[PDB]
């Protein structure tokens, strides 16, 4: 009966909680001590990237570790060369409302997505002079929130329909769909080995998904509010995510219990984006107060602060080789640090 | 600093010129957020779809109405994309009263939102003739029985208005309510002079004239 099924679900929740508690023999805070703290680190704005004139929402370092991409209500994606601080490409977007952008690992394609409900794939490095639109991905009723590239033909997209999807770009149809989430899905992160990927949603939950067969292997909760952004640890066996509760959380895939909560009394509203460094010790998060913070992933204390922008720090990204961090903020100016 | 870089910088400067030209062209636009509820007369303003964007030219000005009803999602996570909108055309039908309480809730939510704490509202009271025809048959007392008072034509409209401004606690957010004349094509003038005011007081407070 239905009541029996609800009772079984509650018993399964109790079993999950008991297994997590018994498996949580200790916490990393008890063993992270007796080590050298990272200490005070100041990052100065090595380069300021100007040219945009609207709300910068998303950026993505390419595998080249030099080129980057950016989006706004400028009506156009722009691909920039970070070293010489000049913009290589200016793709005119079909819809001015874009909430996420991704740069392919091969550098051949770029992806944009937003409230238009369609994922646009633009093909760089074409025989034509200009950047043409390679493909349009439709099928998500909710607004797109985060897209990433697995290969040049496989793209992972999280939308506003509380569902994630994996698309074959050549065919243009959803290779597979993930509907475990209840609330709206905000941000997906691909694993370093491209074997798994996590997605944090509006129900204060982050769900792991296998790339091919695609059932929710793992589900982590503990946030008091909406999850805004997610990112794997470089090892691939952990991931940290930020929420509107002005805290970040670090989860491990092999142990369901969350490891650390990064929070300070000064911050009152939520994180907008997170990313990790090459060593994984330095977690960089774009906070509420037009400011970005740099947390020691093991000491769980604010290692450093970044100079503020004129508006909210919507996105930040650590480059592939870990040479620099680029923060894009609502003030239409990007900043590359070191 | 070799020849290929110099040509790359020239290409970058050309792209900068195109970007600034596009920005100058877009600066002439005025962004209006068209909100409301279901069957609230969204389409009467001019005369998988995430956003219904409409554009029209009037008195040497180009207005963009971002009529969004297809989201059906959590407004708290996508409404900040409309933070920089000149005005909120929050059209409300008056004949139907039902969704009047939920429309008032919506208005309370949107008016006190942190992003729109200072953005003004061009409140539209649609379906005046039908509301006047139906008020005599059914006294307003069904909706807001506390101080419905008389069932008079203009008294009911005044009470509904006063209820709408009462939901605003922002000191510097004037609500330019216009009692929409059913489906007659005159909304352009009130939109234009309301937005002209919005710019006027925006500049006045921008210059620290206080």
């Amino acid at each position, epitope marked *: 009966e239905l009541d029996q099924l609800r009772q079984e679900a509650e018993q399964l929740k109790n079993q999950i909680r008991d297994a997590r508690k018994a498996c949580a023999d200790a916490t990393l805070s008890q063993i992270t001590n007796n080590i050298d703290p990272v200490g005070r680190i100041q990052m100065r704005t090595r380069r300021t990237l100007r040219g945009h004139l609207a709300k910068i929402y998303a950026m993505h370092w390419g595998t080249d570790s030099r080129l980057l991409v950016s989006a706004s209500q400028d009506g156009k994606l722009i691909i920039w*060369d970070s070293y010489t601080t000049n913009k290589v490409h200016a793709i005119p977007l079909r819809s001015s409302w874009v909430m996420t952008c991704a740069y392919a690992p091969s550098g051949n394609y770029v992806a944009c997505g937003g409230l238009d409900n369609i994922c646009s794939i633009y093909n760089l490095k074409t025989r034509e002079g200009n950047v043409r639109v390679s493909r349009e991905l439709a099928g998500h009723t909710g607004y797109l929130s985060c897209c990433r590239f697995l290969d040049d033909n496989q793209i992972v997209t999280s939308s506003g329909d509380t569902t994630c999807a994996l698309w074959d770009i050549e065919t243009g149809q959803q290779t597979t769909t993930f509907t475990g989430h209840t609330g709206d899905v905000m941000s997906l992160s691909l694993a370093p080995d491209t074997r798994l990927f996590v997605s944090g949603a509006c129900d204060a939950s982050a769900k792991l998904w296998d790339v091919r067969e695609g059932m929710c292997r793992q589900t982590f909760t503990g946030h008091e509010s909406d999850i805004n952004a997610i990112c794997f640890f470089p090892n691939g066996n952990a991931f940290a995510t930020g929420s509107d509760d002005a805290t970040c959380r670090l989860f491990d895939l092999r142990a369901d219990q969350e490891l650390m909560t990064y929070s300070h009394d000064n911050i009152i509203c939520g994180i907008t984006s997170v990313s990790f460094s090459k060593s994984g010790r330095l977690l960089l998060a774009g906070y509420d107060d037009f400011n970005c913070n740099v947390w020691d992933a093991l000491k769980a204390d604010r290692a450093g602060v970044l100079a503020g922008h004129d508006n909210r720090v919507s996105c930040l990204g650590v480059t592939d080789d870990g040479m620099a961090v680029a923060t894009g903020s609502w003030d239409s100016f990007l900043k590359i640090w070191n | 600093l070799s*020849a*290929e870089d110099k040509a790359a910088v020239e290409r970058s400067k050309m792209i900068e010129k195109n970007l600034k030209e596009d920005g100058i062209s877009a600066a002439k636009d005025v962004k209006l957020l068209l909100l409301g509820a279901d069957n609230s007369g969204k389409s009467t303003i001019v005369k998988t779809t995430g956003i219904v964007e409409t554009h029209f030219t009037f008195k040497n000005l180009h207005f963009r109405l971002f009529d969004v009803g297809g989201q059906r999602s959590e407004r708290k996570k996508w409404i900040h994309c409309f933070e920089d909108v000149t005005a909120i055309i929050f059209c409300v039908d008056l004949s139907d009263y039902n969704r009047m309480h939920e429309s008032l809730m919506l208005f309370d939510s949107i008016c006190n939102n942190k992003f729109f704490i200072d953005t003004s509202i061009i409140l539209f009271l649609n379906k005046k003739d039908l509301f006047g025809e139906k008020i005599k048959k059914s006294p307003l007392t069904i909706c807001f029985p506390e101080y419905t008072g008389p069932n008079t034509y203009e008294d009911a409209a005044a009470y509904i208005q006063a209820q709408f401004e009462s939901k605003n606690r922002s000191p510097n957010k004037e609500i330019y309510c216009h009692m929409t004349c059913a489906t007659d094509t005159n909304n352009a003038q009130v939109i234009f002079d309301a937005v002209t005011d919005i710019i006027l007081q925006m500049n006045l407070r921008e210059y620290n004239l206080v």
Partner: single-chain antibody, 231 residues
Framework: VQLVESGGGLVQPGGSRKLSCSAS????????MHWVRQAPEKGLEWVAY????????YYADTVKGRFTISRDDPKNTLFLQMTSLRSEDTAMYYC??????????????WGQGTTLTVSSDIVMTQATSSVPVTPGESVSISCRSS???????????LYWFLQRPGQSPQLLIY???NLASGVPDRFSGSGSGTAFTLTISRLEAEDVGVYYC?????????FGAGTKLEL
């Protein structure tokens, strides 16, 4: 991508002539353009260059002052006004396109060219004139520069071109290491300082022709002598 030329033929010395490159099939307005000529017996030599949007215009020392180049984006055309023709001006002219950004491939596509007959810095040294080969085994072609081509950056501005008999040249290697698009993997460029070498492993047919070694670090653009490769 088509770059058909027009406006050539017999002409008296000291006359005037207009050369038209009617580009089609690509974004002409975003592409820098070059005119490169080759004597009937000698190798390639640069003539003129116009940047994107007519921002920058260059000429060769023999070309300077005597010739002019002007693009027309609305109709996708490239005009070379050709004044005071001399006997040495007789050559085949190729209209070339090239876009300069990070990672781009300049001189990727060459036009068919046209013949113009007249009635009567950096020097590229190719230490070879002809190399007898057989299909199936690797070959190496060497090139030398007046000074180091390794700029302040990590890239060395060396380009390799192949010209089959009766065919317009095509790009093989740009910046001395990157292989051009649409080119078989067999070709591989590698250089150090002033000594450069293009290696063709598993040489097959359709490789007979002239190999040209160009520099791009600084203007003017100077080609090599041109190593002939037969059999």
């Amino acid at each position: 991508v088509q770059l058909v030329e027009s406006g050539g033929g017999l002409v008296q010395p000291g006359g005037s002539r207009k050369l038209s490159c009617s580009a089609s099939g690509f974004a002409f307005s975003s592409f820098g353009m070059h005119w490169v000529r080759q004597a009937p017996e000698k190798g390639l030599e640069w003539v003129a260059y116009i940047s994107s949007g007519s921002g920058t215009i260059y000429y060769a020392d023999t070309v300077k002052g005597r010739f002019t180049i002007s693009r027309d984006d609305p109709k996708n055309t490239l005009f070379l006004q050709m004044t005071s023709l001399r006997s040495e001006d007789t050559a085949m002219y190729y209209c070339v396109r090239s876009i300069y950004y990070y990672g781009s491939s300049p001189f990727d596509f060459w036009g068919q060219g046209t013949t113009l007959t007249v009635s009567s810095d950096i020097v590229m040294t190719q230490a070879t004139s002809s190399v007898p080969v057989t299909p199936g085994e690797s070959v190496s072609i060497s090139c030398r520069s007046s000074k180091s081509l390794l700029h302040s950056n990590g890239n060395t501005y060396l380009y390799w071109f192949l010209q089959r008999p009766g065919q317009s040249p095509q790009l093989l290697i740009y910046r001395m290491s990157n292989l051009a698009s649409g080119v078989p993997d067999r070709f591989s460029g590698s250089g150090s300082g002033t000594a450069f070498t293009l290696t063709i492993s598993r040489l097959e047919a359709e490789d007979v022709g002239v190999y040209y070694c160009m520099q791009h670090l600084e203007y003017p653009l100077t080609f090599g002598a041109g190593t002939k490769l037969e059999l």
